[PDB]
Structures are given as C-alpha cells and as structure tokens.
C-alpha cells in the first residue's frame, strides 16, 4: 500500500522557537497532502491542504510545503496554543494514509519534584487490600525513577505508575506510584519508604512514614 | 454550523458486534463523502474506509476489510459504521469525518469521535479511598472500576488549580487512577476539601471528604 513516513516523533521547543515537522511518500502523490492539529481530548483539526493551503481560521505561522514525496510543516514562532500533535495525511486519492504523528512538547528549565506519601486508608484496610501512594509533582523532565522500600529494603512488585501529560499552565509532569499490597502483609511492617531519582539531584528524594505512628 | 453527531461510549464482549452512528447537518449529506477514522489511546489516526451517501459506495482499508461495514440513510442525514467480531485490538475511539469537497477531497469535519471498549470484562463502580497525610497535598484514590472514564473535580470545581489527576492503569481486568489536590496549610482542614468521582458507565457518584487522621 502507500506508505506515509512522518518525523520526528517527538519534538520539543520553546515558544517563540521555530520547528519542522517531515513527511514522507512512498509513492508520487503529486501535492494531495494534509495536515492536521489535535490536543489532548480533542478531535483533529485540518491546518493544511494541498501540501501548502492553510484551512480557515489557521494562524499565518503554520505553513506547509513539498511536492510529490517530499513535504514538511512549518510551524514559525511557536505559541503556547501550538503544543499538541501533529499529523499528516495523504488526502485525494486511497488510501487517505496518516503518518504516525508527531507529538510536539514545551520546553522548560529542570525542576524537582514535590514528592507525597500517603498510608492506606482504614477504609480500604476493612477491604483487605492496602495501597501506598506516592505522588512526585511537578517535574522537568519526565524521566523519573521511583523506589519503594518497607522496613528498609526495595520492592517491586505490586507498584503501578502513571504519569500525567505536560502541563498546560508550568509544563511540568507529574508522577503517580502506587504499592499495593494485602492488609496482612502491611501489617506485618512498618517503614514504608518513597524514594524518588532525578536529574534535579544526586540524592534521591525521600519520603516515608511508620505505620505505628 | 456543519455538525456531526456521533453515538456514546460502547462496552462490548470480544466477539461480538458494534455498530455507531453520526447525524449529519447544516449541508447537503448526499454531498459530501463519509470517512471513518480509528485511533488507540495515546496513539495515531488510522483511516478506515468512507461512505457515499448519494450512490451508497465504499471504499475501504484493506485492513479493515471484513472487520467494518459502514452504510448510510438518506432520509435521516446518518452514517454508520458496524465492526463485528470484535477483539481487544479494537477498542479505540472511532470518528466519522466529512470529506472537503474541492477538487481534491479533504478531510474538514469530524464528530466527536465514539469510543468501544472490548472486553470481557464487566461494568463495576470504583471504591473511592481518602488520602491524608505553607501547603498541604491531599489526595483521592479511584480503584477498581470499569470502564473508563471516570471525573475527578476537588470541592465541585471550586478547587481547579494544584490539581493532577493521573491516567488511569489496569490493575488486573480492572481500573486504578489517582487525585492530588494542593491547597495553603492554613485553610485545612478549617475548610473542608472533598472529591467528587462519577463513572457514568456506572451511574455512581462519589463523594469522599478528606478527614485529617
């Protein structure tokens, strides 16, 4: 079939920056490209057609251009509005093929994180389960490492991470860790121990409480 | 205003059957083509197929040829898409998008897309567990639910700012996600904070005030 290639996958950058978006054509499409915008939790938006005719609305700053294999979009001094992801699209003829995207992210100066560590709630303790949660807040960059200790020693199973997309308002990120254990086998310690690694530090942020206090 | 209108969420068994739809208005419906776009969380748009409403015809990608059938009705300015022995693979948001009219046909207006999930797993509330510990960060922890989504809101939205509520991860067939809310020391707990979590799915709302140990 006909195969798109889009480049980079990520991109980062800072506002007022200038970045380019690639796409590749496997096959001459003459100029029967598109491009589209999509936020998180939004439908996509067309930008472009016919590889360099902005939609209605579209800000002057995006422009596109190429012919036959060859197209990039340009996006000239980025605005915070920008951030979000990028997609092309093969558009008048089958298949109207869309490149993998492009996520395209802010840039910001690193940051630690503002780790909290919260002991199971009694109410899920009279459930049988026990959960210790750990929040590591507003951080830059994304790349983390979180450790969890009970009575000194690390353990990993039964820890669930997730992390937030950039924010919107400081464009930090934001982890959340969860140990979850049985009421039994919590009960049976009592240092419970969040230890969070980033490029912010050389020691390791700790956090901790004891369970008889 | 051209707008698309597309049926709610699904929770379907592996293989068995869906079938969607999307009400069509503010144009011509037998003007313009058809076209049905898939996208997996947190990843690509991927083309499907389109309908002529005017003559009835398809095209299709290859790939989801004998996994979609898509069909229109006139008189009611609606499209619809069904896809039949339905597999995990499948659970993805699913947008109809209507196709440019030129010259060459570009994709300008999309639905606000239908999301399928396909599981065997069933429909269950979530347990709603308070997280205690110049600011304070509390927090609120949504287990074992299904499907997504669920909405967190800290004091019915008059709390908006120093909130993370993070993706939620399957924790054994079932979900799990997290709430952090960071308000001034002083004003807690004189001022009581609580989160509010609904799972439509379920019809459930919850409300967890978040007491001081």
């Known amino acids: 079939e006909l195969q798109m290639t889009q480049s980079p996958a990520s991109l980062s950058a800072s506002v007022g920056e200038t970045v380019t978006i690639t796409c590749r054509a496997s096959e001459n499409i003459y100029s029967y490209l598109a491009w589209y915008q999509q936020k998180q939790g939004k439908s996509p938006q067309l930008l472009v057609y016919?590889?360099?005719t902005l939609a209605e609305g579209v800000p002057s700053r995006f422009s596109g251009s190429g012919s036959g294999t060859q197209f990039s979009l340009k996006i000239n001094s980025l605005q915070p509005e920008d951030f979000g992801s990028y997609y092309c699209q093969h558009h008048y003829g089958t298949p109207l093929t869309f490149g993998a995207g492009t996520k395209l992210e802010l840039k910001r100066a690193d940051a630690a994180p503002t780790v909290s560590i919260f002991p199971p709630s009694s109410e899920q303790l009279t459930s049988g389960g026990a959960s210790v949660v750990c929040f590591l807040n507003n951080f830059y960059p994304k790349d983390i490492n979180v450790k969890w200790k009970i009575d000194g020693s690390e353990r990993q199973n039964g820890v669930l991470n997730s992390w937030t997309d950039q924010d919107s308002k400081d464009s930090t990120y934001s982890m959340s860790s969860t140990l979850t254990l049985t009421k039994d086998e919590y009960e049976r310690h009592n240092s419970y121990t969040c230890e969070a690694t980033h490029k912010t530090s050389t020691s390791p942020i700790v956090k901790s409480f004891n369970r008889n206090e | 205003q051209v707008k698309l209108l597309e049926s709610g969420p699904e929770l379907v068994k592996p293989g068995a059957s869906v079938k969607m739809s999307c009400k069509a208005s503010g144009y011509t419906f037998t003007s313009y083509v058809m076209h049905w776009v898939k996208q997996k969380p947190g990843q690509g748009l991927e083309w499907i197929g389109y309908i002529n409403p005017y003559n009835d015809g398809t095209k299709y990608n290859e790939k989801f040829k004998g996994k979609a059938t898509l069909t229109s009705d006139k008189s009611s300015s609606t499209a619809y898409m069904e896809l039949s022995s339905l597999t995990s693979e499948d659970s993805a948001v699913y947008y109809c998008?209507?196709?440019?009219?030129?010259?060459?046909?570009?994709?300008?207006?999309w639905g606000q897309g239908t999301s399928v999930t396909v599981s065997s797993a069933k429909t269950t509330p979530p347990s709603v567990y308070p997280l205690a510990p110049s600011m304070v960060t509390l927090g609120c922890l949504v287990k074992g639910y299904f499907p997504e989504p669920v909405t967190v809101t800290w004091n019915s939205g008059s709390l908006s700012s120093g909130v993370h509520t993070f993706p939620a991860v399957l924790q054994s067939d079932l979900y799990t996600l997290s709430s952090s809310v960071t308000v001034p020391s002083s004003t807690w707990p004189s001022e009581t904070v609580t989160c509010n979590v609904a799972h439509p799915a379920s019809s459930t709302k919850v409300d967890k005030k978040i007491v001081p140990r």
């Open positions: 016919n590889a360099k």
């Open positions: 998008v209507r196709g440019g009219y030129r010259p060459y046909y570009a994709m300008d207006y």
